[PDB]
Structures are given as structure tokens and as C-alpha cells.
């Protein structure tokens, strides 16, 4: 469960720090 | 409940002990909860969101989400104290083998035999939807996109692609990984954080102003139709053998899992229905239609890998839940042992997960998603209403039992969970009576020529 939890935080900010990243760059 | 022959609770602990005798147990409050998001947010929140906003609650869908969510809520406390009193390997079969017993645990089983098979094929075919939605921008062959009407198409090929896929998955039994499920775990959920922060930018209030165009009685016939994606919290019991301290994180697991997929899912439907029209949201990948319409191309390209990459662990937890069902059955001998070698002169118990997967795989690819919702549903919601009487009854016989969690009030929630859920049993179609009642009677007939030849007979 310890380093579960960094895990799950990590690729949760790189998917919404690279989502925000294209809905920036859009219509 | 009638011919009881109850399974003591002390049997369970040493099927679920000497099964985890082997196994590490090392998981937490925070690997459960990602075990029960993880086979919560699907096909319900990613695809049934369009046609339930659609054809029958509108904006309104939110109130559903609120209705169907308080149902899940009650009945997941119900749950949670079961996980806390009888912390085995086990789900509602398990609970009612040792509270009501054989003949009510012989029903619900046979039920959710079929249950997690349908609602197999249902993931499937939402899967299908976003798979497909995800190829456009290519096409598969038209006749080959979904179940078989009068006009289009004939089989869902993409559905029965998938399902054959994670059957031959589970055939191979990959050792699953605790580190490995948080990370699909947190795709599924960014994604919906993702549609939710960009999505609210774009919302126009004034596809809110028709807030119940169908009235209240659109908003119950749809809140047994999202009621659907509310199902997975059972799947934290699974890990059971793995948890140092099962009494206490089980539970937790279990409603932590339930209020953060609750939330999500009032807020989805909140921003869906603000961005597109309630009437142009009857679509097979909605959440990432609404990326679209909204001229958030490139969005809505995550989105769709991200409900590719996570309603198929709902599928690969569903027809699992399902095979170890099997496994426990025919174990609790009301169904025949099969067998087979694991190595060249060592043979074991054996289900055909090849036969299970392939039958799962044909409903999947004739049967429309509304059908194979609406089917689950009606199991589901009996199941749900067995467990919440359960504990009233585990409550009065076996008073005197440890627990470390149990339900806040001790008759009133448990009876809110049994009316919330009988009240959205009358919402559903009367011809999903038809295959549900005709499955029971076909299981209460084998459970009179065979079920009384088990290991408890004596
Ligand atoms: C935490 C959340 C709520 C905020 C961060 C999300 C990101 C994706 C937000 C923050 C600022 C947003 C932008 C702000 C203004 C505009 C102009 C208008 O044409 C809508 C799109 C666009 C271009 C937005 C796209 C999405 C955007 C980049
Ligand atoms: C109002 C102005 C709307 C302008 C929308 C931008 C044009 C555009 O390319 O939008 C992306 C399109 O929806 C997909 O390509
Ligand atoms: C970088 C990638 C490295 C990959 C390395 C292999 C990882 C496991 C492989 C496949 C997942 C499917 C495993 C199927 C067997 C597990 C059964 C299952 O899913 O059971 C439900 C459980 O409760 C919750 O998973
Ligand atoms: N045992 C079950 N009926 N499982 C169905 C899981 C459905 C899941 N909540 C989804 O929306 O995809």
C-alpha cells in the first residue's frame, strides 16, 4: 500500500498535466 | 427462508484460510479501494450516461445518480459488515450460505452465475462503442458494429473480440499485480477528472433549463438503468486472503470505492448534460462525444484510451467474479466437480473458462447494451436486497459475533437498502422478468434433482 499510493499519484498528474496540455492548444 | 442448511461460519475461515494459506498477504485500505474503483467505473458512467440522459431522465439524470446512488450506499454498508463479520474469499453466495442458507444461497448463486455473465457481455459491448468511436479519426465492415436489428448491422464484432481476448487473459493467469491495478486504476480515474476540468469550460446552462422533461417517473426508470455502474464494490472481498487486517480494510475498501465513484458520477452527469443537449446524447461513447461536439479533439482521444484501457478491467474482474463463482459451487457441491491436469501427472479442479468466456462472447455480440443492462440490473438488485435482509438476520441469529464495522443504524438502514432497491426493480421492463423468473426456474430445478447431492446432504 506505501509505494501503491505515489504510483497512483504520479500518472494521475502526468495524464492531467498532458491532458491540460492539449485542451490548451485547441478550438 | 426455507431448508436451511446453514454453512458455519468457522467452514469459511478454513476454505478462505487454506486457499490464502500460500498467498502474501501484504494489501491495504488503499490496494482495496483501488480493487473496487477499479471494477466500478465502466460501461455504466462512460457509455449508459448517454442513453439514460437521453430517453429518460434528461439533466435530470443527476437526481438519478442521487436515487440510485442512496440505494448503493445502504446496501454497500450491508456488505461492508459482512466483509467485516465473515472476511473470507467471498461474496453474496458465501454471505447467504451462512445466514439463510443452501436453497436462498443456491438462488442468489445460480442468479449471479448469471449476473457477472451478462453484465460481461455488457462491459463488452460498451467497450465496443469506445473502441470503435476511438478507430473513426477507421471503420470496421457496417454489418459488423453491433447486435442484429432491421436495418445495419449483425454481430458486435469488437465486443466478442474483447471478451475472447480477456478469456484467453485468464486462461494464462497472469500474476496480478497490487502496483499494476492503481496505475489503470488512476488512467481511469484522471481521464474522468480530465473530461470533468476541461469539460466544465464549456458548459451552457441552458441544456439544463428542460431539467425533467420526462418528470420524476423518467428520472426512476433511469436510475435502474445507471444504477449498472454503481456494481464492483463486491469485488473487494476477492483480495480477502491478502489483507493483513481483513476485519477492518475490507470495509473501508468497500464504501471508500462506492462515495468516490458517487461523487464522480453526479458530477459527470452534471457537466455531459451541461455541454451537449440531453437529446443528442443518445450515442455509444458519450463522454468522449461530448469532447467532440465541443470542438476538444484532442481530449477527447484520451478520454477514449483511457475508458479503452479501463472498462476492459471492469470485464477482466466481471467474467472472473463469474469463474470463481463456479469454482465455489460445484466446491459447496451443488454443482458437478470438473476437472483437469495443471501438470503432466497432477490434475485440479477445473472450469471452463473457454466455455464461459465463448457464451459470454455471443450474448455480447447479438444482444444491445440496453437489453444486457437492464438483465443485470434485475440480478443485481436481488442480490443487493438478499445481503441487506442478511444482516437483520445475522443480526437476530448470531448476535454475538465480532465486528469490527457494522451498519450505523441497526434496522432502519437495512430496510432503506431492501425498499430503495425493490422500488427500482419496478422500474425495469416486464419482458427482463422473462429471462430473469425463467432462470430461476430453471436453477430451482436443478437444485431439487441435484442441488440435494452435495457436501452437505449427509
Ligand atoms: C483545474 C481545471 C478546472 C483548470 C485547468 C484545466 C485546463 C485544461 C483549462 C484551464 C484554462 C482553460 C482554457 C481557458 C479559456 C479557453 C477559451 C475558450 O475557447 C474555452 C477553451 C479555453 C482554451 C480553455 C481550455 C481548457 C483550459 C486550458
Ligand atoms: C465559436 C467559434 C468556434 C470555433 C471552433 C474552432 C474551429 C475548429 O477547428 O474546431 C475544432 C473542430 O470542432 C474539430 O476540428
Ligand atoms: C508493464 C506491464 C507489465 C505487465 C505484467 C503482467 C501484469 C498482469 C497482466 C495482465 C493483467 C490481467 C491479469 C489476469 C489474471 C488476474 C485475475 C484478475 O484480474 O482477477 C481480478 C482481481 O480481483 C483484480 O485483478
Ligand atoms: N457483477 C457485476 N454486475 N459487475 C458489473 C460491473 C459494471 C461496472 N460498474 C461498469 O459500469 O462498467
Redesign the interface.
Known sequence: ?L???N???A??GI??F???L??Y??? | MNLFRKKPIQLLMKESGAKGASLRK??????LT?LGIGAIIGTGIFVLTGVAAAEHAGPALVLSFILSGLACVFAALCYAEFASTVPVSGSAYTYSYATFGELIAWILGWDLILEYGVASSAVAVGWSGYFQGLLSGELPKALTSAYDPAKGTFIDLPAIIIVLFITFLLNLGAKKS??FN??I???K???V??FL??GVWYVKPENWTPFMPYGFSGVATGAATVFFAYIGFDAVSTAAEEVRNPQRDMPIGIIVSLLVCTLLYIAVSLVLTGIVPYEQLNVKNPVAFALNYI?????AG?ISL?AIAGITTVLLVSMYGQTRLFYAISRDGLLPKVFARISPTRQVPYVNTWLTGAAVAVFAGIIPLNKLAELTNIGTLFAFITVSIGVLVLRKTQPDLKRAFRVPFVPVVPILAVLFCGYLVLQLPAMTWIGFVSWLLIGLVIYFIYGRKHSELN
Request: glycine share 8%; no cysteine.
Open positions: 500500500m509505494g501503491n499510493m504510483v497512483f499519484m500518472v494521475l495524464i492531467l498532458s491532458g491540460f492539449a485542451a492548444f485547441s478550438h | 501484504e494489501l491495504g485500505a488503499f490496494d483501488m497490487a502496483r492503481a496505475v486504476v488512476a488512467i480515474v484522471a481521464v477528472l480530465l476540468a476541461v470542438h476538444q479533439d484532442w481530449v484520451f483511457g
